[PDB]
């Protein structure tokens, strides 16, 4: 049992016709103090998987090292390490899900919520969630922390059920993700303007976008707001 110290906020993601998108801001909070402004919370594994992590940053760095070691280990005595016997998103998730549930069962959890996004060998989209309790679930859209409350409602308007996935293009999906990140910046007190976004497509592969910013913000209407009720000036 511990308490999280340096923490990372929402991770958001969704499926589209040819793959999956995932995003997370670059902030490491220390309580209310916005302490670390250059933290990467999306960690790619190979060219077909991206693991997005929220929660305790020290535990995130541990998980990051486990995944790095996992790639090394898979390559040992494996001539097909970069082909048929490469790491799949489903392999990487199940491994993490095992660790998370084992750690909660020893009453010493990795204080995180994790979303594994990727594309399988046969082209199928993979998107699944796991947290400090070892709870897992899948859905066309997935989000952690605040994202669950604010991002999912917006992303579900694009892909509401399974049959909406083939009808959703990568342009429409990325647009929806970027808009969700803006909304989170408006409303989450532990979020930042800077974020990273990753696309995993069955045709064009893994595109990793760093140093993105929330733009096209509406603030002008603030000038007309005066007082809290009766004040006119």
């Amino acid at each position: 049992t511990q308490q999280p110290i340096v923490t990372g906020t929402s991770v958001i993601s969704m499926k589209y016709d040819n793959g999956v998108i995932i995003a997370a801001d670059n902030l490491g909070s220390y309580g209310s103090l916005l302490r670390f402004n250059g933290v990467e919370r999306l960690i790619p594994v190979g060219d077909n998987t991206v693991v997005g992590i929220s929660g305790d940053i020290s535990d995130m760095q541990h998980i990051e090292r486990l995944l790095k070691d996992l790639v090394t280990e898979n390559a040992y005595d494996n001539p097909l390490a970069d082909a048929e016997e490469a790491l799949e998103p489903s392999y990487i998730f199940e491994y993490l899900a095992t660790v998370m549930y084992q750690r909660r069962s020893k009453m010493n959890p990795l204080w995180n919520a994790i979303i594994v996004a990727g594309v399988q060998s046969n082209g199928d989209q993979f998107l699944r969630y796991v947290n400090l309790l070892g709870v897992t679930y899948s859905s066309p859209t997935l989000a952690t922390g605040f994202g669950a409350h604010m991002a999912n409602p917006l992303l579900r308007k694009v892909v509401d059920r399974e049959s909406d996935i083939p009808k959703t293009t990568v342009q429409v999906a990325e647009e929806a993700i970027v808009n969700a990140m803006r909304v989170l910046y408006y409303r989450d007190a532990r979020s930042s303007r800077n974020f990273s976004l990753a696309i995993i497509d069955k045709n064009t592969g893994l595109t990793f976008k760093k140093n993105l910013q929330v733009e096209n913000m509406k603030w002008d209407f603030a000038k007309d707001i005066k007082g809290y009720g009766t004040q006119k000036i």
Binding site: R104, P109, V135, T136, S139
Partner: protein
Amino acid sequence: QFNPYGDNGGTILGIAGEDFAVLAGDTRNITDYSINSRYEPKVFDCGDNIVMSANGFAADGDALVKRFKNSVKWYHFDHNDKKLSINSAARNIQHLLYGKRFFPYYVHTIIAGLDEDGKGAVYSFDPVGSYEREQCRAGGAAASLIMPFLDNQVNFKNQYEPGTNGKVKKPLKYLSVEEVIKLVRDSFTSATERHIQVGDGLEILIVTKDGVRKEFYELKRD
């Protein structure tokens, strides 16, 4: 302080017929007031014509089902591919559950199948492993909404034959698979209306001598 347990909601229902058995459950997964997934399968085919569902805390539920599926596998290795009977599976699950008596799987488990005479069978477990064979059993969030309805419409409780006025009970006539599914659907439709954690979808697994079949039905998504 760290709390190792959570509640993923959900509701499940097992009914045993004359020569069949059904195990149903909604596909909604939740925490507090949020929806995690509108379709997260909760009832599983475990092989040997046995279906299983462990409702409650999904991490413990998934762990248990995974371990039982494993137990079926090793039963085949160790005992010359012998079919695991539903009664044997039930006793095995008790030992899996009681193994963690002092740090329990926070789930209410139900399995369904056919017994060794070909008749329908359902077994029900508590979190620590006590189990009963039963004819009709709902579990989870909306269990209290469903069971009274089943008592009335399956077992014909409090129903007497017109004209006699309480003297003659309504006879317990056997229900077909089509008739049972109607009652399952109406149970979940009613539960969906009045319980916030129930909705999205209904998945039913039917078990006969021919094997395991699936049926899916939409539920209200609010």
